[PDB]
Amino acid sequence: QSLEESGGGLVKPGGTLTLTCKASGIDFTSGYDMCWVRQAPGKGLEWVACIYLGDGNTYYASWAKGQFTISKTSSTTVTLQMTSLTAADTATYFCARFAGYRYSVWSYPDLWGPGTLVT
């Protein structure tokens, strides 16, 4: 019914932080993914990376493909390893869940966490 998230904060450039997202209880074996979204400080939202809550295939924003990695860690949590964070990555990161529509590939976000900051 809700998403909680943490593991952000300030790391000097080149260091690494990992964000985690915890579900209050969602279906992790169905037509949903869990996905990281970034809100640059003064911009709208940017796509970071998603993982299907099923097989576990992942998708990465092309800008994030060589830097960020995600994986399911448990039946309640998924994490994002923000390898080599830099100044450009300062933002609020959000955890969100996406649904499909009926029989589709087009997703539909339907649940969001509060977001957390990294610098």
């Binding site: 037509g31 649904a99 499909g100 529509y101 009926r102 029989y103 589709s104 087009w106 539909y108």
Partner: peptide, 10 residues
């Protein structure tokens, strides 16, 4: 058109 995942009638 679409759907809602919790209904029918495409």
């Amino acid at each position: 058109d679409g759907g809602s995942t919790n209904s029918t009638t495409e």
